[PDB]
Design a protein around this ligand. Sequence first.
Ligand SMILES: CCCCCCCCCCCCCCCC(=O)O
Ligand SMILES: CCCCCCCCCCCCCCCC(=O)O
Length: 129
Amino acid sequence: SSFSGKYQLQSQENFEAFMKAIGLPEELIQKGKDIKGVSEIVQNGKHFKFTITAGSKVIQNEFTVGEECELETMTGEKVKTVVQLEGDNKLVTTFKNIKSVTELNGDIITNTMTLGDIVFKRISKRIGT
Ligand SMILES: CCCCCCCCCCCCCCCC(=O)O
Ligand SMILES: CCCCCCCCCCCCCCCC(=O)O
């Protein structure tokens, strides 16, 4: 149950640069750079549900830690990958050559995606039940 909670974005580094490189239609790139998105995570042991909302674009995802699962990326592209726990508080996966780390520390979820040399980094905070 550790990741569960509702979280809102506070600040991000390199949003625009990273969203370009991944075939994000520019309309969303500009409308998106400023949205403090909300993440809903529901964890039950290995099983994860998470929903990322950024006004009207709702991406909902589910995975089992350790299993190969379909994930829906930024662009809407669905990609087969495995998500891994590396300790109770850290989700690590790799898709379309992006290395993604999600990390809980207290009420703070830090997510970091790197495409070759670009480090897109989102920091979020818990907002209630
Ligand atoms: C203006 C209305 C539509 C809103 C469009 C928002 C598009 C957002 C684009 C990228 C946001 C997704 C963030 C990645 C998810 C994550 O960090 O795990
Ligand atoms: C749309 C991006 C795809 C998501 C691929 C990462 C899968 C595991 C990590 C997601 C768990 C919830 C963390 C989101 C927190 C945040 O928005 O920064």
